[PDB]
# Entry
Amino acid sequence: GQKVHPNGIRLGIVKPWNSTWFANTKEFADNLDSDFKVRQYLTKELAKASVSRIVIERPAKSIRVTIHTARPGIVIGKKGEDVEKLRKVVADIAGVPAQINIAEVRKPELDAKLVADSITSQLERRVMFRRAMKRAVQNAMRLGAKGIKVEVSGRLGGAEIARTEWYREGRVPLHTLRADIDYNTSEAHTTYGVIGVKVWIFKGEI
Amino acid sequence: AKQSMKAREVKRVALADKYFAKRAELKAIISDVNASDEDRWNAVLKLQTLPRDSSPSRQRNRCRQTGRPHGFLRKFGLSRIKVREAAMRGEIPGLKKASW
Amino acid sequence: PRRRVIGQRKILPDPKFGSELLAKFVNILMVDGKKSTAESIVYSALETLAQRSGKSELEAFEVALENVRPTVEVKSRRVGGSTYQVPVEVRPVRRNALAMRWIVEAARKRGDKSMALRLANELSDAAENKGTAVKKREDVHRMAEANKAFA
Amino acid sequence: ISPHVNKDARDQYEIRTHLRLVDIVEPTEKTVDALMRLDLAAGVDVQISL
RNA sequence: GGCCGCAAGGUUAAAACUCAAAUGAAUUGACGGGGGCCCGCACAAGCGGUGGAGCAUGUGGUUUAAUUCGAUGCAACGCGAAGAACCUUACCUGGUCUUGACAUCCACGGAAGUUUUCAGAGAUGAGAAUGUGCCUUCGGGAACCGUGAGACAGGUGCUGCAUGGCUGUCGUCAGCUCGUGUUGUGAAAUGUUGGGUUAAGUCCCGCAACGAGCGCAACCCUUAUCCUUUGUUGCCAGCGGUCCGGCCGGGAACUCAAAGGAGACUGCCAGUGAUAAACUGGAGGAAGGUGGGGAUGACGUCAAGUCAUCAUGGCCCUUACGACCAGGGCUACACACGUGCUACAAUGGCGCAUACAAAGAGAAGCGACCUCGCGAGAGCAAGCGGACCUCAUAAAGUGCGUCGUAGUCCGGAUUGGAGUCUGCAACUCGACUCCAUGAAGUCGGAAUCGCUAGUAAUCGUGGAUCAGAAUGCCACGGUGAAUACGU
# Structure
């Protein structure tokens, strides 16, 4: 049958939130809309910088945004000339003072969003999907994970009938609520239609 | 939704913001007791010459991301599908699955 | 059930007298969770019944029950494609239960004015060996007797 | 939770709001200035009444 | 055709034509009106309903200018809709525009408040007032109103038999598989089978197997018993005032509020059992053997549902399958079916007056006290972004009277007259109030549904959607049963 969302079911037990502010009923909807627009703009601008997470906070009467990336140099640029433009445009969108901070990802092969993005990028340049999936699994198990799973669905290889395939290694206990599971997805647009990708990574019990 | 329906909504909100005070004045006249009985008649005849789209009751709530006219929640400004997607991704502060 | 054992629920005694048989009677008479109404009916009936016979309410009640309790009944069995009636013995708890159910069912079918009056009349008739409850006991015993070949 | 018909199959969610009250009985100029000159976390709402 | 036989028949024994197979032995499943063992409101033991009446609401059909599209055995039919008078709206009749109602480009001039005539309106024409900022090195045009041309915009149009994402169901059932080793020419097998036991592929012992993974259980929420912290807006045993009332001085004990801790594990006793795993009973304890209720859905099955939430490959239309506007339709009515509400009465109807809850919502909002109206309501006006004010008075119950088995002092369909409120506007097509009227129906044929305990049955209260429109959906408490020998 159908499965529950790992991140969602784990919120508050072992997983944190991606947004943190208090509001009343006459500010809630507008705050959500502003956050949506900020994330949209940043994700379009930084599509070649390996972004994985955008965290937003609203203290007092300002907005401060933290970006999680594996290539901080590309984002910062020459003495901040690029972060400055980003800050200006973000402040314009939000309508209040703005601030931007940058955080580094040490191991990009143990991050679920980045792995899915890499697989999708390979699929769009006519690479063999078994090859891509196997490489992802091997890299993750070599750099120290306790378990990984990868799944791909669609018109694989150009076929007429759609299909789904998956691979697994190690432990991936999805009914244990104290287990730390990272989960994310991605999509590919090819000449035959859309193809979908899901990734699970297990890191230990807390 | 089509791109024309959202335009319709934008136009409605604009006109209703434009003509707010005049309608309040005329309705106050009509409702108030002990009036000339001719001012009342003239006010009724004048309230119906303003644009129809200036009445706040011609507006319909729509999801801010898709335009859906059904299944709307006021606290969030979205429909049920988008509410669930955001909630599972972790983008709505304080919200989580409940049992009791 | 298949693999179960069920214990016995506890029943509080009556407030006026001190019997659990009377509490069970009130329960069998109640409808829709309205216990006060049923209690009023039962007490009025017992009062109007003790005057008619110059003895205690509990004594009259026991005399009425002893004429409606059954001893044997028939169950239905079908293994060879035909239905047979098989006589079996009744046990005391079921004896009391059946007698109470039959008495109340008969009382509800009368044509007097109020439920208390109908109940009093039925109890007096049972003490005298008359009425639908006694007729029911007789029919059950007749059916049990006609099928002794299948014991 | 389905894009179409099925009428059972629902999800149920909650939001909890926690609240606290503190009373200061004998204020002074320094205390009030210190209180007004403070900054706290980014998910807490503070209201001061005189 | 020959030979033999009384006959029935026996024996020797072809061709034309036609098909790409027919066959033997073993392997993994499925099935059996084959056998063995075990489970489930599956039967049995019980309580209350649907199927007949009137009304609400969905579907089939039929009608219509249109009655917009989708869901169809269990797993469609109070379903997408958590709310169709205009709008929503995707449908019909009529009136109108062609780079466009919604974007990016080039270049030719200039902008928003009021107010007059014709239009059903869309949209055409007349007027009056105004000169924003801002390196003007004059090139700013940022901001935002017109018009001209062409790259373009636009589509709730088709294919869920081209797809991503999301969901139903077998089923909260206990199963589904891999690595190395060994057996067989092989498809495959063992492990996972066997003796016990469990809610459980749960645990123990044996055994050519030795190990591991996804599922089972536990970690998460809520409910029941204690103690340490802090006591306002919540609480009053003791102490003292009297206008009687937690009202005032006070108190921090108790109810309660919400943060840290304690507690339940076959842990202790006796018996049974393979010197086992476990089972039956007992003490203490608020609670005993999964204490009660949630969330949590394995590998897979049905080319199951959704291109009309959204996104997307391939087709298809561009002075039209794309825009705008006023009226109508989605509410029709010989008929068939599903899900509900109200009844057919004395365990009751009507009148008087009097106890006891829980959980929620509230600034274009919730609307007290007081005055007017028979009533739906109206006028004037405090308080509250709330353990403080408002919605807001629980009902079944209890005491006292009356009605006396009647189509009634039971039931409340239908229809006439007079009104209120929301809203530009209640004819088609809203809810509610007063006076009058007072239909079917006296417990429901063959079929058929739910429930094992604070459950069924019965009584009231709140919210989402929402200008206004619940007998539906989602939540809360009060009274409170019957029965389970057995497979």
Observations:
- The domain at 20-147 of chain C is CATH 1.10.455.10 (Ribosomal Protein S7).
- Chains C and D do not touch (no CB pair under 8 Å).
- The two ends of chain C are 26 Å apart (CA to CA).
- The first helix of chain C runs from residue 20 to 29.
